[PDB]
């Protein structure tokens, strides 16, 4: 029991880590969004 | 920004 | 012990697969942003 | 060997509220965003 | 897009 | 919104 243990925690180690790299992406991609929103307003107003 | 190219008319979001 | 351990990992479990419906939900919600930059962008220039 | 693996877990639980606080983070600018796309509209038509 | 309707005035952003 | 102000031009953001 103690190894299934063990190899679930590090399956949940190994998702945490492919969670961190998914936010990552949407944090560049919601940076790029802020760029776009501050590039029509100063181009139009 | 938005992927360079002088702009590039957005270049898709900077390819999404 | 062990009970108690593995009680919690499939808490934690839990909890990880709630944290990626909401990062399903943020995605969504950016998408559409995405879309209403690039109409703004059309529509306006 | 169970001491370990419930400090991993601790350490993992740690993890989880920081990824959560992110995630919050994340919110409160994706909703700026949405607030800005929705004053460029009104604004300009 | 935008939840259809021929643009519905954004639909309140695809009802956020 | 936008950090109040009067609009405060966007607050950058407000404040990113
Ligand atoms: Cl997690």
Same mark, same amino acid.
């Given at each position: 029991?103690?190894?299934? #243990? &063990?190899?679930?925690? &590090? &399956? #949940?180690?190994?998702? /945490?880590?492919?969670? &961190?790299?998914? #936010?990552?992406?949407?944090?560049?991609?919601? /940076?790029?969004?802020?760029?776009? #929103?501050? /590039?029509? /307003?100063?181009?139009?107003? | !920004?938005?992927? !360079?190219? !002088?702009?590039?008319?957005?270049?898709?979001?900077?390819?999404?």
């Amino acid at each position: 029991r103690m190894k299934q #243990i &063990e190899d679930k925690i &590090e &399956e #949940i180690e190994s998702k /945490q880590k492919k969670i &961190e790299n998914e #936010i990552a992406r949407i944090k560049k991609l919601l /940076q790029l969004t802020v760029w776009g #929103i501050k /590039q029509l /307003q100063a181009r139009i107003l | !920004g938005x992927x !360079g190219x !002088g702009x590039x008319x957005x270049x898709x979001x900077x390819x999404x």
